[PDB]
């Protein structure tokens, strides 16, 4: 029994175009925006949602089931990640993520992304280590390493999820 943190998507953060599953574990992009209460924590233009739980210390694992189609990115964000207006999806903006775009897997480095030659992903294990300052990604099938960002995190870190195209999704386990 691998001990993973119990995460729920934070509806107060979700872009209004996102459709969250009724268990708040899954996210996809809808065809149209919902009328949601204006909230300071809400991503009003970028297609993002955070978990309701953030981390200041220790080691935390969770898993993300990923769609086969382009349009998703996920990882962690610093709490101060900007919510309002169009923002860059980059480490400078406090986003540390992997992405599926044009049939290829990427670590979202800046100013150019880093192609991962990892083969098809069904489910990814995220290993957040706030003792050492790292976030690592593994393919669950054989636990092959995908990517590690090494960050001297200076604030609370939140699980981050983005879906910018219809026809794909992300789902938190457990």
């Amino acid at each position: 029994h691998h001990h993973m943190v119990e995460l729920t998507l934070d509806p107060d953060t979700a872009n209004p175009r996102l459709i969250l599953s009724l268990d708040l574990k899954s996210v996809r992009l809808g065809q149209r925006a919902q009328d949601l209460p204006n909230h300071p924590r809400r991503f009003d233009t970028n297609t993002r949602v955070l978990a309701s739980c953030g981390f200041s210390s220790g080691r935390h694992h969770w898993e993300v089931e990923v769609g086969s189609k382009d349009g998703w990115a996920f990882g962690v964000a610093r709490e101060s990640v900007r919510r309002k207006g169009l923002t860059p999806f980059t480490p400078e903006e406090g986003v540390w993520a992997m992405q599926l775009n044009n049939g290829q897997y990427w670590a979202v480095t800046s100013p150019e992304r880093t192609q991962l030659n990892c083969g098809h992903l069904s489910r990814v294990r995220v290993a957040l280590d706030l003792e050492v300052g790292a976030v690592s990604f593994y393919a669950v099938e054989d636990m092959r390493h995908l990517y590690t960002f090494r960050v001297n995190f200076q604030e609370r870190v939140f699980p981050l999820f983005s879906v910018c195209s219809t026809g794909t999704y992300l789902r938190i386990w457990p």
Binding site: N46, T47, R48, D70, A73, C164, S165
Partner: peptide
């Protein structure tokens, strides 16, 4: 439409 697809990924 690649225009919407490129414009889509700017919203990530």
């Amino acid at each position: 439409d690649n225009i919407k697809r490129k414009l889509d990924t700017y919203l990530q």
